[PDB]
Amino acid sequence: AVIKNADMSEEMQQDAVDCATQALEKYNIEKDIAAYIKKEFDKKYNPTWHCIVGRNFGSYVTHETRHFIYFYLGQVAILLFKS
Amino acid sequence: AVIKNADMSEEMQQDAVDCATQALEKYNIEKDIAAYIKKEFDKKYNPTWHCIVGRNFGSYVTHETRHFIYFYLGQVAILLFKS
């Protein structure tokens, strides 16, 4: 797990990584992987989260401070943020 | 321009397409393209917009009604929505 950019507590970062890890074990399709992570975070840390999972994409978003992480798990990039 | 999924007025859909078209002429990096579109929509339709541009990604997001578009410009996918 390589964190490329973050504005997030270390504990919440580890939870994002763990949640993404669980999502990748279960789901093959990026949209489903994203949905699993997004839903877990809405549940655990309140709405409203958004999650993008992919190999080739750029983004520009607005996030609540302390609630932004962008990382790779293997060759997969994951963007997860609250807005 | 191929619209894949929209919850947005026909008029705003046209604006999203024109905006993305202009961005692709000015920029070739996904992040820059996304930033162009996001900033223009924030300015014209109020914050808070988010934009994802890329050939390979899946997403799961939450959007205000009438403020969501997912389309292709050629082979590049664009997701633009307001939280």
Binding site: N5, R55, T62, F68, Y72, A77, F81 | -
Partner: peptide, 12 residues
Amino acid sequence: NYTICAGTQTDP
């Protein structure tokens, strides 16, 4: 106001 903008780009 607790918000800020950020951008991301995938590796080549």
